[PDB]
Design an enzyme around this catalytic site. Structure first.
Site, PDB file in Angstrom:
ATOM      1  CB  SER A 193      -1.032   0.019   1.163  1.00  0.00           C
ATOM      2  OG  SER A 193      -2.086  -0.900   0.891  1.00  0.00           O
ATOM      3  CE  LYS A 241      -1.667   4.010   2.132  1.00  0.00           C
ATOM      4  NZ  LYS A 241      -1.569   2.961   3.232  1.00  0.00           N
ATOM      5  CB  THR A 242       0.958   1.436   6.723  1.00  0.00           C
ATOM      6  OG1 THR A 242      -0.466   1.533   6.432  1.00  0.00           O
ATOM      7  CG2 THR A 242       1.188   2.266   8.053  1.00  0.00           C
ATOM      8  N   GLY A 243       2.025  -0.100   4.472  1.00  0.00           N
ATOM      9  CA  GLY A 243       1.685  -1.098   3.461  1.00  0.00           C
ATOM     10  C   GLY A 243       2.007  -2.480   4.036  1.00  0.00           C
TER      11      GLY A 243
END
EC number: 3.5.2.6
Lengths: 267, 272
Positions: free
Chosen positions: B52, B216-218
């Site tokens: 992500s 922003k993570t993923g």
């Protein structure tokens, strides 16, 4: 008690169970028919007024569309209790559009005051209400003083019936241009503060948009538009409650029970 | 190199290399000082799956296109029952109606929403539009290739939907803080990163109150957990960029977040 709230089969029994004062309008937008309980008595809007503050902003932006992208500074000194979104942006700024979203979906109080500054204060919101056909609801003060209520002082009050008609005209009718009313509906649909209130009592057949309000004394309110997921005409449901003898949490239970009773009345 | 990683070995690690050994994983980090350009890091040029974290650049791509067609942000896109994926916390509420492109942008940055990302790919011209935007911005390494949820898959030697820590750090600097976008666009993007709701247990958990953080993570269901962030000093001064990419399949999903929080603690000590 909790048992008496859950057993209540009509609005009067519900009001008796919490020893409070309850005001409800359930409005069928297809027919115009309403089912009410004290629907013409005044109650303090508390944060339910934020729905119309946001509408006032959208209405002004229809004549000056750059308004929504304008940025307003958020200062540490402007932070009030319950300012979950604006607190992250203190020392910088936010767009008017993101302030609108924040004040609806988290009830952010600092966002609300900044938007009052942008639109021309309580008189601007009142002017928008009058212009929309509502001669009852009125905005007079900013946060957090607007949450105060005294019998016979009509500042910052509405009636369940007036607010139901206004929600219908503004969210579903022609007061705003289609793009504006759809943006407002989407914010109401994304609300985060109402999970234990009307939504807790309404079944899966409804897409719900709502805005809650409360104060620290005895008031807990929730106003909602219910769209049938299968298609059909929406209903509007407003619920205002003053009940100082039960707990904050129990006041949400009363509103959930309003939703259960309403869901049965619609069939 | 840990045979049986524990929470305690992870929180005891005091440099990136020791943290990698403690979780028996592969950790890629870049800490970038935007005022001097110097970088500190680990495996900074190795490829990792974006998962992500690519959404930050999908949103930047949308904003870049909207600078030329401003009504694009207000265009409404239908959300169909058929578009719904497993992670659709915002779009699930709007199935059967529509949402503005701008609100889809917000949803895909601040939640796990994967349906929003696919709807936005439809608007911009797909993964190739994101890659083209990255190339024009000066990134020759990062690449978007697939739709959700397939883009979250990774295999050694398959470069689809990958980046490196150093490349993403430089791109975040140019896009979030530099001149790739117009000021109003870049500020909207920064605000979405600052409003992120999925990252409380990752870098932010390890970073002190002196930083305003956008991130922003993923992650995927195999072994990847990532977080990229821009750190603004509350007191004023130059921001730092911190990218962290982790593969660690021997520890649990929750422990992968602890490793990222520890990256945050280490970084905070290094900035001084």
């Amino acid at each position: 008690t909790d048992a008496a709230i859950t057993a209540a089969s009509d609005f009067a029994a519900l009001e008796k169970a919490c020893a409070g004062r309850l005001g409800v309008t359930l409005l069928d937008t297809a027919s115009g028919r309403r089912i009410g309980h004290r629907q013409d008595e005044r109650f303090p809007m508390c944060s339910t007024f934020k729905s119309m503050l946001a509408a006032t902003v959208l209405s002004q932006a229809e004549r000056m569309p750059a308004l929504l992208d304008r940025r307003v500074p958020v200062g540490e000194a402007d932070l009030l209790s319950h300012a979950p979104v604006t607190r992250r942006h203190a020392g910088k700024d936010m767009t008017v559009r993101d302030l609108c979203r924040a004040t609806i979906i988290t009830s952010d109080n600092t966002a609300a005051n900044l938007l009052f500054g942008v639109v021309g204060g309580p008189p601007a919101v009142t002017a928008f209400l009058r212009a929309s056909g509502d001669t009852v609801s009125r905005s007079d003060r900013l946060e957090p003083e607007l949450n105060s209520f005294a019998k016979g002082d009509p500042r910052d009050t509405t009636t369940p019936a007036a607010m139901a008609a206004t929600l219908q005209r503004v969210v579903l009718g022609e007061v705003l241009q289609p793009a504006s009313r759809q943006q407002l509906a989407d914010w109401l649909i994304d609300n985060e503060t109402g999970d234990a209130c009307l939504r807790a009592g309404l079944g899966k057949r409804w897409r719900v948009g709502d805005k809650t309000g409360s104060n620290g004394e005895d008031a807990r309110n929730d106003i909602a538009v219910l769209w049938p997921v299968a298609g059909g005409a929406p209903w509007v449901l407003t619920a205002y409650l003053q009940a100082g003898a039960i707990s904050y949490e129990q006041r949400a239970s009363v509103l959930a029970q309003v939703g259960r009773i309403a869901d049965r009345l619609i069939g």
